Symmetry: C4
């Protein structure tokens, strides 16, 4: 009796419900307001996120130019030493620049002393060489006597004896330089924020693990952010905007939870009526509202993290950015729920609903072939091909090849081996040709055929 | 009675109308003449447009080589100073080259003195440093005391004391060098045109807003064009050609307006007959003729601007070029109006007419997803990914990815973060894979399906 | 009566004709032999073609390294002078290297003296500056007085006063250095060929036509090949192979001409029978045999040219290579004539036969849009975009964009103008987005739909 | 009678057979175990394969930096000498560095003396110049007198007179430097493996075969691996894992062979029953089991090779890697055999089975066109186009072009010839446009149509 009318009303559109019981669509206007405010909050956060990331990266580039002898932009991957004299000069240049920093640097840096290892108390720079405990290497007689246990020896340099360093080249594992520098991110002032205090931990590595006559040289930094002690800025909204976002998301969450509860109660009543199928029950679950509550939770968590970062209780910019960006994407996607009511505007969702199961079953069979190719390429071609170094990189290369991207350069990276390793080159030819042909012309064609057949069904 | 015959005649083809009432198709021959003359005028204008653009750009490159110490082509994005000595040397090199310009430069330049700020009367070069009013920075004690108000102090150099410049490095915001140079674009002589007089305003910036120990250095120019005073060229068509273009476009406009008026009158009579639907009225509007009158207006405006530029009353080359190029494109497109009469030649337009509404409705749903991805990528990945720096650049990157372009390099730009920021790298993996899969395999497939289904309908 | 049987036999396959009248298929075996021999001849010619091209290009690169001060590989497009001292040094370096060539060069070169202009009798090198007859340039007073007539003044240098060169910088149009060198292409010995004598005409240009303060510097060569005088090589097939190719092509031509004549006679008889439609007559014309006779003519012409080049009567390697390569492609394509008899192997040709007319009609409408875009892009974007410099380059860029290639870099080349010329940048955005959308999603889709519909018809 | 039931059981699924006769599916669990263990073995082998390849390549790069004067990374393709003084300096630098190696090198190398040619007994380095027996070259008189027989003259250098080298430049064919160095691959210690002893044979070539004034310089190495004599590593699983892989593959092979024999016997019985068609017999052959036995043979061979390499009996890393990688790919693909039983999961295989014959027939016709284009492009464009140098490279370029990849750069590589060789440039335009249009829009469309029509059939 009334159950039929109740269900019919439960599955009606906002305009239909307004016609029926004069219900005002507050959820829709809330969604529009949410899109606006969440996007604005994301951009406002992005300002400070960019400030932090830029400070870290620019300081690291400046360190590379200051401490690496003969360094130039774009040389990171090939920068290396090849003679004993070059290596000694690089090490001494790094240490001398560390000692001269106050007089030459464009930035203002403070020294850090002591702390844990590798620094002794009062020491600012640690210069450590690591070598085998016993190494006797005699290629002339085709012999060696090695105790592979690593011994670390190093020199402590106080900021304003290291020149007596003697490297044990034949059994040298690596050389490292460790030091910390303190600086202040003044640019924050442009965003009406109090500058933070940064500590950069700088590691310079001269790596000899390959014992190949080529020692690559690299510099890396780790940044630690902390609040400064009683700072002063002459004449030192966002909080209220964050509170507004929180209120909007809370109201949206409450309305969506109420709708889900109403749907659950109606589902229970209908099941009781029928009894007097899991899918027939899930038909009462509004997936869009589950997405909306997930988005609200994400947005509130991101806003709380953002408030904490602004208050200087936290410094996890990356997590906050990921939370807020994902929530913004979900908020933008959420409004399709209201287009679902009209067939002329619901082609994408209607087709995906029919296509997805067969697509998943197809992927079941395609994935094992894809993984076989991934592992084979990674292990066989990785030592020779710059695009096959790692499994994730192999997956990227194969996925791009399926889409027709970067094909000729992939083929050409192997041309160097046609004269050196002919068998590997021939294998790479067969591998690439077979993969491209199979996946572009057979697999992808059938995938698209499944999707277009589903569309033909729903149309 | 006669209304049926009149409407049938009104909807007939040029050949059919010639058969019926012996009407000569002057509009079609006018369209052909218009294509020829408008294209020729565009090319002729392009000659002088190229001359102007080349003068500006070549002078700017020469300035970069003259005034930037150690500059080389292709280094614009990374050119920077890293030590106090480097910065002082760059500043003094720029000023010294400015003073030596008459003796060393291959071009002939005249100095400009006085005028508004930043130059005092009689001064040719302004060397200005901008720093915080009060800056006390103490990273050693984790303290600072800042009044962020910017103070500008600068030295005036008369063209043929600046060597005493002392930079306040710890609170320095930036350094700028401003000067103006006058020159003459002699190359115009090859196009039988009188050379113009150019003033180049040159700004060299040493930017320290990030306070990161790396100060990027850049040079920019702004060009002002003016007529020279009583020039003399020994033995100093285009005007007549412009007048011909104007006459052709005016006649085309008159004929198209007459046709539109006739259609409007016939529409009114038919509506009156029926009365004794907005679409049923718009059926009488020839959209091709609206396009043609728009193209005629654009062409006449562009020709008037071109005449003014040739007379030296205007120098807005870019606006003129845009007007004339758009009008040329529209003129070329306009002749499809006559192919519309024959079905075997009207596949594209006939199919678009049926497909466009459903395509627009589909875009309604796709656009919110696209914008969500744009904002998320711009804010989360922009600090780390060179292709996500700006919203327009993000849109370009995503649009290219949809078309399969530049995929692997997009993936590879993030490989540097796999060791530094693992969470951001993982997010970028999920973001790129999900976007590419969704848009290439689901969205684009259904878009093409809509278009091909419309074609199946009209065929 | 007999006419039906005669026609049925005339349209039968080689196996069917062998069954009917025991006819041996000599044309087919001739085609196979032709493929083999023509391909082999192409490769054999390619050996000597490569030798000639390599000699020219390697000599030109060596000249660039010898005569251009500070030249390095890959700098051709940006190599330029920027100060008077740099230009003087480059000019004097080129002349000094010309004079020192016998002592420093790795190649063996002989000087050429006299001849026509610009060299006087006995002169090996001509150093010429071209300037305006009267040039008074006064940017300070915004005035000039120019007689644009070009005066050429130049110095003659005898191979082993030019140091007194005074350049008129303010009215200088360009500077050129002309000289000729003779050398011998010894590498020909590896191919059992007598070396040729080469004369390289070398032109070095310092171009100041833009009067922009930047003078680009370039070097170009023209090679003239001649037989040497009574050469001697101790112990100094291909001719017989060329004769064999000629005989094979002649026999194929004769058989195809006989077949065409037989078809023409049968066509005339059938028309006479019917009389007691142009297409109904062209149905008797074997297009494959027209292609075969064209290929035979091309092959014979190429072989005669190759024999002449080997005999040293000709040196037009490029024309011979084009003739032989085209003939090889046509010979390879010609064997599809025999697959046309079997439907399971004739899908491509059968479908093209049905699709081509509608494709041509579609192209009629698409071409005007494409040309409008070409002209608009060439004139509006060419001064700003490296990929739009020339009309052919614009066509290449747009054709590649239609196929999804190089999209993001096309967008990115304009990002530099977003700050300098905002209006041009906005126009480029609209231009690229509209072109890509229209052509990839609407035009190409309908093109493929036409082809697949034709296939659906023939299947 | 029983034959029908026997055949029906023979063609049932694992679950169906378990229902029928309670058969435990040991082959399927064996396949899962095989996937796991084979993939793990491949990765474990990849560790040592990477160690070997890295040692070889890093040593070669170090040699290039040590022995090539003025060498820098990325200069391999253009590195060349252009004056006699440069060539002498490069030769003497290489020899001097060879003599100074113990004092300057970061690696530890031992000299090799004597052996076969080109070294005499006691000699470590051979410096050999090769020139024509008689060369008189007179370009001034357009004459030459050559005996092309090559004479080799060379100097022996003992490791710690070559300075008196006099090069016969006008008839010089090339110069080579040969020497061998011994070293130890210590990095193996990180993988708990005993280091191997490497001998690097180093060849430095200064090539003058073109006699063009440009002499390219290159360095190449060949590595020979051997076990060292009585090495000692303080405290010097994989064997047991290899044995486990062998056992698993052997059991899988036995089960698959038993299944194939059972199928053969059933086939014979059915044929005997019918007698009282080759395809009707091949219907009894399980192709998946043939694939599985092939994979088992490959895996066992690869494992035996891996054990031999670990024992130091072999050093063929490339062959072992190819065997194991191919076997891993086949093992991953093999599990689709069990998905073949379910139609919803068998779309790919079911469609391929129907599409493959028509695809092969289509390829018959397409291949001759493709080969014609390959040969034409290789011979005509190869001397001018970097992507057409070799036939394999031409095939890669054309295959990539079909897939839309690298189009604009292919067009742009020819733009340099538009001014030099206009006829070749025009031919390249026609060649590229025709190939791309024909193959992308006609051939590929029909290929995809065949595949999708087969899918339409099986669905
Ligand atoms: C009945 C249905 C059942 C389910 C259907 C079948 C499911 C299909 C599963 C697909 C699996 C494909 C294999 C990918 C993994 C291979 C690469 C890999 O592991 O990377 C190594 C990397 C790490 O390896 P690495 O490179 O760091 O280490 C290599 C080792 N060294 C460094 C020592 C050399 O792992 C990853 O982080 C995973 C990256 C791959 C992820 C790509 C898969 C897609 C992700 C989801 C987005 C798509 C959503 C689409 C939805 C949109 C529309 C709604
Ligand atoms: C019932 C039907 C209703 C309508 C149907 C639905 C309409 C669909 C609307 C599409 C909108 C898609 C979103 C694009 C905007 C995102 C990018 C953006 O805003 O850029 C930022 C830029 C500016 O941002 P920015 O990068 O300068 O600033 C970033 C901020 N900083 C610098 C501080 C880091 O804005 C633009 O200039 C817009 C560029 C995007 C334009 C692309 C859209 C297409 C243009 C029209 C051409 C296509 C015509 C096709 C017709 C051919 C066939 C007839
Ligand atoms: C009824 C059916 C009958 C059969 C149907 C028709 C069969 C179709 C045959 C295709 C042939 C196509 C021509 C390619 C050869 C041209 C290039 C060449 O030879 O290279 C030169 C190279 C060597 O040349 P080079 O470049 O080293 O030498 C040039 C000379 N110098 C150096 C002096 C300048 O040869 C090769 O190594 C071959 C490379 C091409 C291989 C590509 C073909 C595909 C390989 C198989 C993988 C695909 C499997 C797909 C299955 C997946 C799904 C199940
Ligand atoms: C994201 C959940 C969508 C659920 C599909 C049903 C549409 C009402
Ligand atoms: C909704 C998940 C929130 C995760 C926050 C964790 C921050 C360390
Ligand atoms: C550009 C306007 C086209 C209007 C479509 C109707 C064709 C007669
Ligand atoms: C038809 C629009 C003309 C715009 C001209 C404006 C130039 C400043
Ligand atoms: C290349 C000419 C082909 C002619 C088509 C008819 C096929 C017998
Ligand atoms: C790889 C062999 C597959 C054989 C096709 C038949 C499937 C049972």
């Amino acid at each position: 009796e009334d159950l039929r009318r109740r269900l019919k009303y439960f599955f009606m559109s906002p305009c239909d419900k307004f016609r029926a019981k004069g219900r005002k669509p507050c959820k829709l206007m809330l969604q529009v307001v949410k899109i606006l405010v969440v996007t604005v909050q994301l951009i406002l956060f992005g300002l400070s996120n960019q400030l932090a990331v830029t400070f870290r990266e620019e300081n690291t580039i400046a360190f590379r130019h200051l401490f690496l002898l003969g360094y130039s932009d774009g040389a990171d991957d090939t920068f290396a030493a090849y003679t004993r004299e070059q290596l000694y000069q690089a090490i001494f240049h790094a240490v001398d620049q560390y000692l001269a920093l106050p007089d030459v640097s464009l930035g203002r840096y403070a020294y850090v002393r002591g702390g844990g290892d590798p620094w002794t108390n009062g020491s600012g720079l640690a210069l450590c060489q690591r070598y085998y405990h016993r190494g006797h290497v005699d290629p002339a007689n085709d012999t060696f006597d090695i105790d592979p246990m690593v011994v670390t020896d190093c020199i402590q340099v106080d900021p304003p004896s290291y020149k007596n360093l003697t490297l044990k080249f034949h059994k040298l594992v690596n050389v490292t330089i460790h030091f910390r520098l303190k600086t202040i991110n003044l640019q924050s002032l442009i965003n009406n924020e109090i500058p933070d205090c940064y500590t950069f931990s700088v590691l310079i590595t001269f790596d000899n693990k390959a014992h190949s006559g080529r020692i690559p040289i690299s510099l890396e930094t780790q940044a630690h952010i902390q609040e400064c002690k009683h700072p002063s800025v002459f004449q030192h909204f966002r909080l209220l905007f964050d509170v507004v976002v929180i209120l909007t998301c809370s109201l949206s969450f409450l309305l969506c939870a109420r709708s889900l509860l109403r749907g659950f109660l109606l589902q229970n009543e209908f099941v009781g009526f029928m009894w007097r199928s899991l899918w027939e029950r899930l038909e009462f679950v509004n997936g869009w509202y589950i997405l909306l509550v997930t988005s609200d939770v994400l947005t509130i968590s991101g806003t709380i993290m953002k408030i904490g970062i602004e208050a200087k209780n936290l410094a996890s910019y990356d997590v906050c950015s990921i939370l807020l960006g994902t929530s913004t994407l979900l908020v933008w996607v959420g409004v399709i729920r209201y287009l679902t009511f009209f067939h002329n505007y619901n082609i994408l969702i209607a087709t995906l609903r029919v296509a997805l199961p067969s697509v998943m079953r197809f992927c079941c069979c395609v994935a094992v072939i894809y993984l076989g190719y991934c592992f084979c390429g990674w292990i066989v071609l990785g030592p020779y091909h710059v695009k096959f170094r790692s499994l994730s990189m192999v997956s990227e290369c194969l996925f791009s090849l399926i889409n027709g991207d970067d094909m000729f350069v992939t083929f050409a990276a192997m041309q160097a081996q046609q004269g050196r390793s002919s068998l590997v080159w021939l294998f790479s030819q067969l591998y690439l040709y077979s993969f491209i042909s199979l996946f572009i012309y057979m697999v992808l064609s059938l995938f698209i055929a499944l999707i277009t057949g589903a569309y033909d069904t729903i149309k």
